[PDB]
Design a binder for this molecule. Structure first.
Ligand code: NA
Ligand code: NA
Lengths: 235, 235
């Protein structure tokens, strides 16, 4: 049922409009296998370039928005990321706002090392999602994707396993089922936003509650297409 | 000696790329009188449009930068604003950085209502400038403009007088003279960044230590050209 979803988040890269154009030419020639929804998020100064030049079967995303949405929409940009850990290091209201204004969102959550070490990851993440849930207007869940970022495994010297991804995506789906029902839970894509590379994307994709990825550094490399194509391993 | 300087800061406006293009067409037809250096700062998503379409005798500025500079430079953008009150509501280091990386900066300062009411405006502003001063590399003062923002008069129900502008720009020039010498003090443009409109720009321009303006809302209106042309009243 759920279409696999892969978002490439360039973060604050590349350093120049010439490199961005070379990256776009590479993406435009990529052969996508299977069935997958691809979105690419880029720095604001590069959005008009992406929007003009990126293959039209993929969509462009902002990496964040402000309390602005009309400017981005005036370029024809439909998506934004919200809540990404770098920004985090309010949100339910900003989700409500972006959605009321016709945006599709990638809503990020995830716990830090102390909560993970304390055995409280599931509690901490559940609470984040329980706060998001009232802020989604009726009829807007089709326009929501949730990304789990294991912030505890980013720059800490700790690594996340494939089972950690699966467990945390299941936690999220279960809290959706508990609070807004099985139909919404069954349709919402829940992404893994930890370190995703060509060497682990296929095993992660196969996890039953992992519907895709919010990709960091590999989104600037030819390996992105391997990650996009890992959808063929997700059932 | 010092060339009058007017920076138009669009802030988070206009709401759409179509309106930005209409504003640029208006600016491109404007007849500038006298001698004046004009810079226009715009949201990041609109910088490539400004850079392509704005009259080449004016320059485009970023409204802020991050600890990025290469991206902006790759479009050929030479300026940025730093320290603007909205952003404020670290900096000396970011000034050093932007300058070392070839940027020209508009460095903002200014005190809040409590300091103004307490009689401490001059002390407060002086301290801000004394912090900026060590962070300017030797030989980079030609690439620095300072803007005084009377933050105490923005959204507080208090208004600033022409004499308040003059007094506060003089304070800044005096601290430059005291700390880095009369030659640098005599050449640095010090701008007034309070409410500047066609009805008060000429009287402000005539103030001896006011070298120009960092314009807010009037920068989106045909009145901007009146403010640019107030340079003929500055001696
Ligand atoms: Na899966
Ligand atoms: Na003057």
């Amino acid at each position: 049922m759920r279409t696999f979803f892969v978002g490439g988040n360039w973060k604050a890269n590349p350093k120049t409009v010439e490199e961005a154009e070379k990256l776009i030419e590479m993406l435009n020639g990529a052969k996508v296998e299977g069935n997958v929804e691809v979105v690419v998020a880029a720095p604001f100064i590069f959005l008009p370039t992406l929007q003009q030049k990126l293959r039209k079967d993929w969509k462009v995303s902002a990496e964040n928005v402000f309390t602005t949405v009309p400017m981005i929409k005036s370029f024809g940009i439909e998506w934004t990321i919200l809540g990404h850990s770098e920004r985090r290091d309010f949100l339910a209201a900003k989700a409500k706002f972006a959605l009321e204004n016709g945006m599709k969102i990638i809503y990020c959550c995830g716990e830090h090392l102390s909560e993970r070490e304390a055995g409280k990851a599931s509690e901490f993440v559940s609470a984040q999602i329980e706060k998001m849930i009232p802020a989604i207007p009726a009829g807007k869940w089709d326009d929501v994707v949730i990304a789990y970022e294991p912030i505890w495994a980013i720059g800490t010297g700790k690594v996340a396993s494939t089972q950690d991804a699966q467990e945390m995506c299941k936690v999220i789906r279960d809290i959706l089922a508990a609070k807004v029902g099985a139909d919404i839970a069954n349709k919402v894509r829940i992404l893994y936003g930890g370190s995703v590379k060509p060497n682990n994307c296929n095993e992660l994709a196969a996890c039953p509650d992992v519907d895709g990825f919010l990709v960091g550094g590999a989104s600037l490399e030819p390996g992105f297409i391997n990650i996009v194509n890992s959808n063929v391993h997700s059932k």
